[PDB]
């Protein structure tokens, strides 16, 4: 249904092996994490990953109920009320180069098709300096600008990641969505205003950790929660369906309106997300809702959904329940949500399964526990751990010790180098454990103290 098979075109080339290689720490720890399957004929699997990868998007939720409407509104009405309505277009100029919030537009990533097929990269069809596109580009670009999106693609091609050994096993592979660049730099101009203060400003009042540094974030977060009775965890992460296109139609005309400071274009933007064509080989798809990956503002609409989407459940659940009963913090996938009641999530759950959306605890437990605190919870893979009045987030074990036990060459020192930062809230014991594969076959690795100290000095 949401999953049409359009006519062949050319063969766009598809990664079919992993550049990820083992640690000598893989040995040692073992991780049940290895390389996700990118070929037909990976002998872990009995599954083809071509047919799994996409049956995802065979079905939709087509249609959602007036309580999503509602709760998208409220929710607009409080991000506003905090962010402000100065959210118009932005320039080209202004889009390429990024501002206070967002990094500038990254020159060296891919400039989705035609031009990959061509062997281009986004260097050639822009010029950074004055911001001028090339002909064909101008010309694409213009298009979209008189709400015609009909000539856009998407570069599908699988994930190469760690993913867990059942998903291995099962050939449950994600997909990576290139847009076209010109459609990355109209959906910057449009969208960017707003996520520069969207993201610039993480916290419970917001309802979005979008855009934090767990190292510094942490203290407010759990400060903000901690008074709260309870604190509970909920992951939407699930391979086997989407968001529903109905989602996109209530934040085009509820939450990224024109009544909200955006421009006319953003509906049809969203439009360009929502239902989109996507080039996988030979093979064309015309696909139904879902989120494509590859967009600058992906995390961020996931998140907002994900965040209406908790409250709709428990309205769905509670005739008594309103806005206010809990706080929301949300992040992609990962949401936490503060409370002074006790709320039942596997009722929740159900709620929600009735409008095509899973929900599960955020560790490794099928049901969810009715009582659940800041130090039970689990956020980005992440505990909350008291150190006097600063919280630090402590990383998942396994997660670590997966991290550790893969490389790609090249960029192995790097890779070290930012897990020792998050290694470090594990305490110096563990630290010096996780990393003394390393240590003991002659690598140089940061001592404890140094980035113990470096840590402690954001809040002197
Ligand atoms: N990619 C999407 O739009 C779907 C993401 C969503 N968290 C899910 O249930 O899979
Ligand atoms: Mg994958």
């Given at each position: 249904g949401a999953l049409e098979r359009l006519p062949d075109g050319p063969r766009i080339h598809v990664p079919r092996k992993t550049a990820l290689r083992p640690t000598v720490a893989r040995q040692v720890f073992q991780p049940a994490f290895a390389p996700a399957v990118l070929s037909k004929f990976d002998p872990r699997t009995d599954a083809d990953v071509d047919e799994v990868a996409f049956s995802k998007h065979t079905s939709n939720q087509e249609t959602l109920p007036p309580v999503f409407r509602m709760v998208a509104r409220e929710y607009a009405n409080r991000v506003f009320a905090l962010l402000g309505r100065d959210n118009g277009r932005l320039s080209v100029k202004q889009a390429l180069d990024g501002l206070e919030g967002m990094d500038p537009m990254d020159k060296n990533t891919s400039p989705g098709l035609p031009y990959t097929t061509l062997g281009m990269r986004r260097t050639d069809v822009v010029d950074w300096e004055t911001a001028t596109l090339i002909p064909f580009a101008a010309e694409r670009l213009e298009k979209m600008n008189n709400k015609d999106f009909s000539d856009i693609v998407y570069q599908t091609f699988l994930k190469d990641e760690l993913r867990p050994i059942e998903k291995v096993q099962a050939a449950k592979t994600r997909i990576v969505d290139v847009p076209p660049f010109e459609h990355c730099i109209l959906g910057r101009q449009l969208l960017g205003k707003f996520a520069s203060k969207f993201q610039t400003q993480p916290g419970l009042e917001l309802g979005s950790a979008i855009g934090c540094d767990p190292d510094v974030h942490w203290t407010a977060f759990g400060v903000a929660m901690q008074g709260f009775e309870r604190v509970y965890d909920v992951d939407y992460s699930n391979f086997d369906s989407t968001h529903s296109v109905a989602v996109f139609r209530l934040l085009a005309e509820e939450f990224f309106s024109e009544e909200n400071?955006?421009?006319?274009?953003v509906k049809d933007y969203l439009e360009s997300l929502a239902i989109s064509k996507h080039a996988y080989e030979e093979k064309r798809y015309l696909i139904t809702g879902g989120l494509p990956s590859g967009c600058a503002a992906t995390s961020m609409l996931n998140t907002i959904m994900n965040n209406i989407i908790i409250r709709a459940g428990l309205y769905l659940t509670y005739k008594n329940f309103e806005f206010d009963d809990v706080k929301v913090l949300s992040y992609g996938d990962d949401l936490l949500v503060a409370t002074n009641y006790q709320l039942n999530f596997d009722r929740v759950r159900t709620s929600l399964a009735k409008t095509g959306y899973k929900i599960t605890p955020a560790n490794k437990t099928s049901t969810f526990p009715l009582e659940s605190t800041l130090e039970d919870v689990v956020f980005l893979k992440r505990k909350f751990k008291k150190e006097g009045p600063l919280y630090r987030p402590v990383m998942n074990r396994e997660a670590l010790e997966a991290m550790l036990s893969y490389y790609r060459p090249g960029t192995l020192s790097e890779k070290l180098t930012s897990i020792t930062m998050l290694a470090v809230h594990s305490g110096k014991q563990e630290y010096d454990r996780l990393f003394a594969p390393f240590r003991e076959v002659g690598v140089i690795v940061p001592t404890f103290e140094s980035v113990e100290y470096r840590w402690r000095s954001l809040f002197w």
């Open positions: 400071g955006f421009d006319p274009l």
